[PDB]
């Protein structure tokens, strides 16, 4: 099976704005995660064809990745900083749903999540 289409990253019919918190999420939170040694499996959508994960999209129905998150932040897709935070937590959660405890991939997610939460705890008002 092919992969599914990637999540939406721009919508004409969705209102759009810029916030202080949305800047921190891009300029601080995404940047820091993006440069982490274990960030690479999360920088684009799960390619089940390339990675030979034939059931990935049978089990995961709400895919998300940092690649999408970046695009969404750059095209002003988000209205609320809460929407963006939900996207990160979806990404992490999918990992933990699909994979077993201790698989390499889970350890790489858990390392990034630790860092995510550290940065989210210093989000501005």
Interface residues with ligand 5D2 (CB under 6 A)? Answer: 38, 41-42, 46, 51, 53, 95, 98-99, 104-105, 107-108, 111
Q: Residue 82, class by beta-carbon neighbours within 10 Å (0-12 exposed, 13-18 middle, 19+ buried)? A: exposed
Q: Quick one: residue 76, left, alpha or beta (phi over 0 = left, psi -120 to 50 = alpha)?
A: left
* Closer residue to ligand 5D2, CB minimum distance, 38 or 79: 38
* Closer residue to ligand 5D2, CB minimum distance, 6 or 41: 41
Rounded to a whole number of angstroms, the minimum distance from the CB of residue 56 to ligand 5D2 is 7
């Amino acid at each position: 099976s092919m992969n599914p289409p990637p999540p939406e990253t721009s919508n004409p019919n969705k209102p759009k704005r810029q916030t202080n918190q949305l800047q921190y999420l891009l300029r601080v939170v995404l940047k820091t995660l993006w440069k982490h040694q274990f960030a690479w499996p999360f920088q684009q959508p799960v390619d089940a064809v390339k990675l030979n994960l034939p059931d990935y999209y049978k089990i995961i129905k709400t895919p998300m990745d940092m690649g999408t998150i970046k695009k969404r932040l750059e095209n002003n897709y988000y209205w609320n900083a809460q929407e963006c935070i939900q996207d990160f937590n979806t990404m992490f959660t999918n990992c933990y749903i699909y994979n077993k405890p201790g698989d390499d991939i889970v350890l790489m997610a858990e390392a990034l999540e630790k860092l995510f939460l550290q940065k989210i705890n210093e989000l501005p008002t």
